[model samples]
Target: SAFITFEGPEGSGKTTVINEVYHRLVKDYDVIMTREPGGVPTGEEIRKIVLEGNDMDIRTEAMLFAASRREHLVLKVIPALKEGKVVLCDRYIDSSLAYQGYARGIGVEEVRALNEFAINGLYPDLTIYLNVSAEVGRERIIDQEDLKFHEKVIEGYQEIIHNESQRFKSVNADQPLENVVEDTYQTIIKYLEKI
Candidate 1:
C-alpha cells in the first residue's frame, strides 16, 4: 500500500513538488494523484460544506472533514491502495489535525480521534511535509489569511511529526522549486526501493 500526502500552506510549493513527484511516480507505478475532501463522489458533496462557509462550528467542520475523508478513503484511496497503486494526495488528515484541531483550539487529540476512526487505521504510508516559513510563504501567496492559517498549521505539524516520526518526513519549501522536488523525489524513491 502506497499513500503519500503533501502538506503545507498555499505558497509552500505544494503544487510544484507534488506535481513533480506525481509525474515521476506515474511513469513507474499505477498512480492516482488526487486531493482529498473532493476526490470521491460523497466527498465532493461534503467538500462544499467544509470549504464554503465560515458559519459552521469547530466540531461540525471537523466532523464534516472526517466524514468526507471516510467517503473518499473508501471509494478512491482504499481501492487504489488495495490494487497496489501509488496514491498521492496534496492534503489529508494532517490538514484537519493542524487547522481544525491545533489552530482552531479543538484539541489535537480530539480531532485526531475523529480522523483515526474515519480512516479505520489505514493511515498514510508516507507524509512529505513541505516546510515553509510563514513570512516567506506569506509574501509568495499574497493572501494574508492563508498565511496566518499556515503559520498555525506549521506549529501543529511539528507535534504531529514528533509523535509519528516513522510515517513522516519534511522538505524545505524555501529552497529552489527544483531542489524541493528533488528532495521529495529522492526521499520517496529511496523508501520505495527498499520496500
Candidate 2:
C-alpha cells in the first residue's frame, strides 16, 4: 500500500484537494484520510496544544509534533498501512521540519534527526508538495488572526522544498483549484503506476 502525504504552506488548498481525492479513492480502496498531529484522539489533543498554546518554544513544538506523529503511527497509520490500506495524510514530518526548524531557525537537520528517532525512519512513501509562491500563500491567509506565524510557515515550506527536492514531487498550487486537483491526482496516479 502507498503511504502518501500532501504537504504545502497554508492556503495552498492542500486540504481541499486532499478531501476531493479522498472521497474519490475511498470507493476503490480502504482509505484513511488524516492530518498530522491529530489522526487519533490522543494525537488530536496534542495538536490542540501545539497549534494553539503559546507557552511552547520552537523546540517544544517540534517535540510535541513528533510525539503526536508517533501516537498517530501506532494508533492509526501503521495498522492501516499494514492492512494494505492507502493512508493519505495531509501533513507529516515535513511540516514540523519546515515550520519549527527552518522557519523558526531551529535547524531542519536537527529536527529531521529528532523526528527520525521518534518515527524510527518510517517516512512517507510519497510526498506531494503543493508549490505556491511565498507572497501568494501569505496573501491568502493575511486576513487570519495568526498572520505572522502563517507567514513564517510559508518560508519554512519553501526552505524544505529547497533542501529536500529529491523526496518531494512539486506541483504548482498557484493555478486554479481544478488545475491543482488535476495535477495532484496525476502525480499520485503516475507514482502508483510506477511503483
Candidate 3:
C-alpha cells in the first residue's frame, strides 16, 4: 500500500493531472483518488463551513482544516491503506503548511505541529509537487486576486520540499497540459516500482 499526495498553488492543474494519473494507475493497481477537506462526510461538512464562511479568523480556519484532515485520514484514507489500496490524495498536510502556515503568517512549524498531532504520523509515501509559478498560476486562473499570497504559498512549498527532499518529486507545470500529465504519470510509475 502507498499514500501519494499532490501539491501546488491554485490553477496548477492538480485536479486534472491527478485524474490522468489515477486512470493510468488504476489499470495496474488498486488505486483510489481522493481529496483533502472533503474526502469523508465529516470532512465535507467542515469544508463547506470553511469555504462558505469566509470571514472567520485565520487560526480558526487552520484548526478547521486540521480537524477535517483528521476526519478524512481516519475514516477514509486509513481504511484504504488497510485494504492495500494506493491512495492518491489531491492535497495533504503541506497545503495547510503552505496556505495557512507560511502564506497566512502562522509559522510553518506551528501549523506543522498542529497537523502532526491531528494526523498522528500518517504521512505520504511519495508527494508530487506540481510546481507552477505564481505568475503562471495567476495567468491560468484569470480573475483571481492576491498574487502575493500565491507566491508565498509557492515559497512555503519550496521550503517544505527543501527540508524533506527525498519524498517530493516536483513537476514543472508551466508546460503544456499533456506534458505535465505525462511527467506526473511517469513520476508516480517510477515511485510505485521502487516501493
Candidate 4:
C-alpha cells in the first residue's frame, strides 16, 4: 500500500499532473485518487465550513483542517490502504503545517502537534512537492488577490520541504506538461518499486 500526496501553490499544475499519473498507474496497479477536505461526506462538510465560512480565528481554522483530515483518513484513505491500493491524496497535514502554521503565523510545530493527534501518526509514504512561485502562480490562477499572502504561503512550504526533505520528491512545475507528468510519474514508479 502506498499513500502519496501532491503539494504546490495554486497554478503549479499539481492537479493536472496528479490526474495524469493516476490514470497511467491505474492501468497496471490498483490505485485511487482523492483530494483533501472533501474526500468523504463529513470531510466535505468541514471543508465547506472552513473555506466558505465567515472569518474565523487562525487557530480555529487550523483545528478544523485537522478535523477534516481525521475524517478523511478514517473514512477513505485508511480503507484504501488496507485494500492494498495506492492512495493519491491532493493535500494532507503539510498543507496546514504550511498555510496555517507558517503563513497564518500559527507556528509549524504547533500545527504539526495538532495534526499529529488528528492523523494519529499516519503520514504520507511520499509527497510530491511541485515548485511554483507566488508571482507566477497568481498569474495562472483565477481571482488573484493578496500577492503578499501567497508569497508567505510559498515560503511556508519551503520551510516544511527543507525540514522534511526525505518525505518529498521535488519537481519543477514550470516545465512543459509532458515533462512534468513524466517526471512525477517516474518518481511514483521508483518509490512504489522500492516499497
The regions of model 2 sitting more than 4 angstroms off are 142-151
- Looking at model 3, the pairs that clash are none
Q: If scored against the real structure, what TM-score would every candidate get? A: 0.93, 0.88, 0.94, 0.94
Candidate achieving higher TM-score, 2 or 3: 3
Question: Where does model 1 exceed 4 Å of error?
Answer: 52-54, 142-147
Candidate 3 residue lDDT tens string, 1-195: 999999999879889999988988999999999987555888899989998986899999999999999998998899999999999999999999999999999999999999999989888999999999887888888423487788889999999999888889999999988999999999988988988
Question: Which candidate number has the best lDDT?
Answer: 3
- lDDT string for model 1 (126-163, tens) is 88998888777776674566656678887888878878
C-alpha positional error of residue 28 in candidate 4 after TM-score superposition, expressed in Å? 1.4
Comparing 2 with 3 on lDDT, the higher-scoring candidate is: 3
lDDT of each: 0.84, 0.82, 0.91, 0.88
In candidate 4, position 78 carries an lDDT of 93
Local accuracy of candidate 2 as per-residue lDDT tens digits, 55-165: 778788888889898998888888889899889988889988877777778888999998998889788888999887767776665355366667777777877778777
TM-score-best of 1 and 4 = 4
The RMSD (Cα, Å) of candidate 4 is 1.5
Better of 1 and 3 by lDDT: 3
